[PDB]
């Protein structure tokens, strides 16, 4: 049996500048099997208003998803993402680098 650990990438759509229109993206890629749990977070509390692009396939039999949500950058607030896979024993949380 062969499975793969997901690669989590959190980043913004447009260049970071506080007090403007932006989008926070979390790219979860290179994982197998398909069953996952992904949630975007704002200082700890989960964001409900989050849209995600349906399951996508890759040449190396791995999958990838994009979880995105609209936001306004501010230096006070810190954003992150919690990802849980079958390969992961503890839900891996990756923070936004800004």
């Amino acid at each position: 049996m062969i499975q793969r650990t997901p690669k989590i990438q959190v980043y913004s759509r447009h260049p970071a500048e506080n007090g403007k229109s932006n989008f926070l993206n979390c790219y979860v890629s290179g994982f197998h099997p398909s069953d996952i749990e992904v949630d975007l977070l704002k200082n700890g509390e989960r964001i409900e208003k989050v849209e995600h692009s349906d399951l996508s396939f890759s040449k190396d039999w791995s999958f990838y998803l994009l979880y995105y949500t609209e936001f306004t950058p501010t230096e006070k607030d810190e954003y992150a993402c919690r990802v849980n896979h079958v390969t992961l024993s503890q839900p891996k949380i990756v923070k936004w680098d800004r």
Binding site: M1, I2, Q3, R4, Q9, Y11, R13, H14, P15, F23, N25, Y27, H32, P33, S34, D35, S53, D54, L55, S56, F57, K59, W61, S62, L66, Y68
Partner: protein, 262 residues
């Protein structure tokens, strides 16, 4: 301008989640163009330029075809699970498609996978199946006995698939053949104490084919360059990173050589 048409199939044994047992998606160079699932049981157009322009008979018919395929794919999966003697959840994947190059060279591919690993690889030039294990060999002899199917697959990958790809390409020319310039910006960031890292970023570009490099005094490029990944931005464009520990950023996209100085 290189382009690629590919179709993916996924079959999950006992989903043990209300997720589709079978999912099928089509792509024209990393763009969703068609989708199907065992729950909806209807083929749906993902791209807008092919939703109304393409005839309705297409989805009407290919839906019935997909419904037929779903069951076959299940049988293949369960049979393999009976050969290895496993219980639980196992994945069965299939990929088929062609590739059109700048010169016009045709290159097709057909592959089968079990539990995320290569199981059977089809070679059209010699009309043969490549098996990895004895179980794969067992399905190999049964597939190779039926030569009509092999020949059909060959002619499909070599002619039919390219035709489909050309058709799809002409439907969405304004999207697939579009060119958007990247917004390049340089950012200074201190990660380790004393170590100052220079980042170069490019946001919002299409197609994703892009080249990035860091230059010192505009004459010499450095080997200490840490490259990131071409990430999707969300709006339909892409973004990329290039970093180095510490003079000039050089980004080349669609024949445009862009220079930024620090």
């Amino acid at each position: 301008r290189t382009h690629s048409l590919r179709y993916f199939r996924l079959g999950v044994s006992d989903p043990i989640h209300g997720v589709p047992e079978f999912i099928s998606v089509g792509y024209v160079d990393s763009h969703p163009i068609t989708t199907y699932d065992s729950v909806t049981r209807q083929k749906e157009p993902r791209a807008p330029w092919m939703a109304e322009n393409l005839a309705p008979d297409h989805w009407e018919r290919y839906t019935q075809l997909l419904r037929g395929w779903q069951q076959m794919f299940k049988v293949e999966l369960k049979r393999l699970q009976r050969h290895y003697n496993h219980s639980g959840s196992h994945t069965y994947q299939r990929m088929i498609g062609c590739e059109l190059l700048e010169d016009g060279s045709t290159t097709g591919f057909l592959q089968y996978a079990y539990d995320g690993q290569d199981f059977l690889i089809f070679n059209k030039d010699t009309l043969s199946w490549l098996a990895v294990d004895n179980v794969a060999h067992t399905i190999k002899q049964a597939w190779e006995a039926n030569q009509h199917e092999l020949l059909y697959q060959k002619n499909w990958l070599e002619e039919e698939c390219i035709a489909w790809l050309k058709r799809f390409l002409e439907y969405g020319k304004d999207t697939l053949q579009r060119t958007e310039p990247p917004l390049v910006r340089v950012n200074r960031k201190e990660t380790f104490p004393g170590v100052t890292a220079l980042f170069c970023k490019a946001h919002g570009f299409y197609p994703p084919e892009i080249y990035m490099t860091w230059m010192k005094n505009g004459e010499e490029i450095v080997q200490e360059i840490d490259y990131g990944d071409i990430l999707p931005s969300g709006d339909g464009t892409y973004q990329a990173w290039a970093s180095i520990e510490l003079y000039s950023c050089h980004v080349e996209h669609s024949g445009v050589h862009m220079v930024l100085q620090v």
